[PDB]
Each structure stands twice: as C-alpha cells, then as structure tokens.
Scaffold this active site. Sequence first.
Site, mmCIF file in Angstrom:
data_model
loop_
_atom_site.group_PDB
_atom_site.id
_atom_site.type_symbol
_atom_site.label_atom_id
_atom_site.label_comp_id
_atom_site.label_asym_id
_atom_site.label_seq_id
_atom_site.Cartn_x
_atom_site.Cartn_y
_atom_site.Cartn_z
ATOM 1 N N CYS A 160 -1.039 -3.834 3.982
ATOM 2 C CA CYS A 160 0.150 -4.476 4.077
ATOM 3 C C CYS A 160 1.337 -3.939 4.779
ATOM 4 C CB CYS A 160 0.843 -4.837 2.695
ATOM 5 S SG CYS A 160 1.981 -6.156 2.517
ATOM 6 N N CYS A 209 4.806 -4.728 3.174
ATOM 7 C CA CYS A 209 4.995 -4.344 1.910
ATOM 8 C C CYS A 209 4.050 -3.248 1.294
ATOM 9 C CB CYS A 209 4.819 -5.543 0.922
ATOM 10 S SG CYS A 209 3.055 -5.984 0.674
ATOM 11 N N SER A 210 3.567 -3.302 0.043
ATOM 12 C CA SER A 210 2.760 -2.246 -0.370
ATOM 13 C C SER A 210 1.664 -2.725 -1.230
ATOM 14 C CB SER A 210 3.599 -1.327 -1.107
ATOM 15 O OG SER A 210 4.357 -1.996 -2.304
ATOM 16 N N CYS A 211 1.488 -4.034 -1.094
ATOM 17 C CA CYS A 211 0.519 -4.734 -2.010
ATOM 18 C C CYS A 211 -1.093 -4.070 -1.874
ATOM 19 C CB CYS A 211 0.380 -6.298 -1.540
ATOM 20 S SG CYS A 211 1.570 -7.403 -2.130
#
Lengths: 203, 228
Positions: A107, A110-112
């Site tokens: 991601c 983000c950090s999904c």
Amino acid sequence: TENILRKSDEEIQKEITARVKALESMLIEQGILTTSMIDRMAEIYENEVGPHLGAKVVVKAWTDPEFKKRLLADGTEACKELGIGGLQGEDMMWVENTDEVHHVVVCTLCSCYPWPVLGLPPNWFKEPQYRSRVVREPRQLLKEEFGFEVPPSKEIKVWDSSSEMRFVVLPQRPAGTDGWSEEELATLVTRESMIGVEPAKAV
Amino acid sequence: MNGVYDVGGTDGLGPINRPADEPVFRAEWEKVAFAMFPATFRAGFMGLDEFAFGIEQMNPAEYLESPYYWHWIRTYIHHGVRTGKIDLEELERRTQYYRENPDAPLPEHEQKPELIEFVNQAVYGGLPASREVDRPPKFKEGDVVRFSTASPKGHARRARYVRGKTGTVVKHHGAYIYPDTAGNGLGECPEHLYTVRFTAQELWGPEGDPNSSVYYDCWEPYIELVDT
C-alpha cells in the site's frame, strides 16, 4: 540514515511516552478507553491472530484443488470455511504465484494489510522505503533486500492496495514436498511468502 | 492531497530497515496507541477514511521518520480537536505532568464490559466497507481506461504516479465507501470499485521493467473510458 536535526532515540521515546500517557488519561476520563480494553486488543494481536492462520489457508489450497478454486474465486468466503476472517480482512483477494507470474503486495499511500490471516504488519511494510520503491523497481528490490531472484522473463505483478480490498499471495508449493501432511507443509509458509517478498521455504 | 505520504515512485528514501526479529509492540505506549483505534472509532472521533486524512496532515519530516504508531496518536489528536472532544491546552498541561511524573497513576475509572464486547465483535465480525448501490457498474473487465488528473486538496486515494495514466480494468469488486467523500466528512457515498492494470512502461517510461505491471484500485469516478 543520519539526520543531523534528529533527537536521540531515547529522547524521542521519552517524549512520545509522556504524550501518549497524557492522551490516554483524557480518553479514560471521557469513559471511552479502559485498561481492560487496551489489554484485550494487545492480547488478540500478540497471541491469537497471526500468520499461522494464513499458513493454514495456503496448505489447504496446496492439498485441496477444489478449495484452491474457491479461495481464488472469493478469498473472504473461502477463509471463512476455516473460521478465519474479521477486522481489516473483510475483503480478501488471493493471487496465485506460478512459473509465469510472481505477485507482490504493497500500500503506497497507507499501511493496509490482511490482519485476519497475517496479524499486524511488520514495521518495514508500513515504512516509506519499501512502499516507495516496490512499485518502481520490484525486481531489483526483491533481489537486494530479500535475496529473492526473479528471472527477468518472469512477470512481476505489484498490487498497490489503495482500497479496503486486501491482497494476499498464494505462494507456489516447494518442490520435494510430495505427500507431506498439512502440518509439515505449514512449516514452509512464511509471512513474507504471503506478501510476495520471498518464496515459500525451500526443502 | 499531494502530500509526502504519497510515496509511490519516490527515490532516495533509503535502505529498508528490517531487524531479523521484532516484537508486535516495541514499547507499552504502542499497545495504548493501537487500542485507541477501536476506542476513538466507537466514540465518533472519525471513521477509517478520516483516520487516514489525519495522518496525511502531519508535518512531513515528522511523518517520514517517526514511529508508525505515533502517526496514529497524531490523528487521534487531530480529530479530538476537530470534534471538540480534546481540549489542546489541557492535553499540553497533562503532557508536562507526565513528563515530570512518568509513574503517576492514570485516572480512576470503571471497567466497561461493553467495550470488551465491542473489541471482540469488531475483531471477529469486522467493519465491512462494501455497500449496495442503485447504479450498475460503468466499466467491465477488458475496458481500457484513463485515470483522472484531478488533484484535490482533501482526502483521496489518487497516487500521483497513476494520475493521467492509461490502464486496463482487471476486475470489478462491487461498490464500497468512497474515500473522497468519507475522508472529508461528507458521507459514505459509495462507488463501484475496480482493479486496473498499468504497465511499468506506462508508469515509468523507459526506466520501467518490460515485464512488470502495477495493479491499482480505482473507484468509479477516478477512471473514464478509452476503449471498451
């Protein structure tokens, strides 16, 4: 990398600790946070949910071709067959490594990450060094950082998970594992193999 | 917006730091920051898209080098102040108190079975973002499409490395909460969601791998048709 502007790690930790404790005290007084709530969340992701759940899925697909079909058709519903699912993995799509295709997940914004099958992501997955580069030079990144040599003729598909869909890599079953039990096979499946940064364990 | 957290394709950020084994939580404060996510979610501080927007408004140098769970703390404070639930001046005074008295006790409080109930239900039941909508999908597998060049300053999921690029629709997933409304306090306004494949040569020019592609998730407004 050194930053001449940056405080020491001990001083940063001391400051963060005070800031967190102050915020914690305020949410406790609001009645929305309690010590048992904190302990429960930590207990689940330290000892309950982790990559051993993802390994069970991988080994079932390796030994059950019909389950593999369902897993690739709908990852959320297939994982539900094993009681695996929930928060931050409500929507899962699994992608299969083959002799012709290698898959890697990221991601960039983000950090999904698929919590129900892998637990919480390792810090490197969430940090800017992996995220920035894997979409741009995946072949070189896999070799330099993970010692993983993907031959140039083999396609690398990088899945940049910009939505609530979670992508999970189904690694190829290692050679020489003919007839192994599921418990034997799970020893070869790693968190890294389900991100795509490494293959499943050799031998 | 066009912030530093939109790191895809950025060079010069350094080698990957990957200690051979690390714990789930590196310090007690990380466990607290982690558990504040369900807590502030239940209390109405923010949803998951708004959560992301808070991180996106950090000081960029602090974002690049601070511990990950510190980003979470910054978003709780952001939304705590935005909604009037956190008084900044009281927070600043309590921070100094805990600097000077690090072992001072937390406030007295009662435990609440409903919060354990919430944790358990959220963890095993999840918080699904899929939604039903009255419109059919505009696009379908095999369609060739172009990603929008729009550059909103509010929250969105439009990485700069894909803006204006041409790709092929790989899958339609159904409709989902739409970040460009949700993250800005404007509601779920769900939109169909697709994965689109962009070749590395389309993204990076000649410096792109001739045998690699990036698969990127696009909500319906992000893409317009090129060829069916």
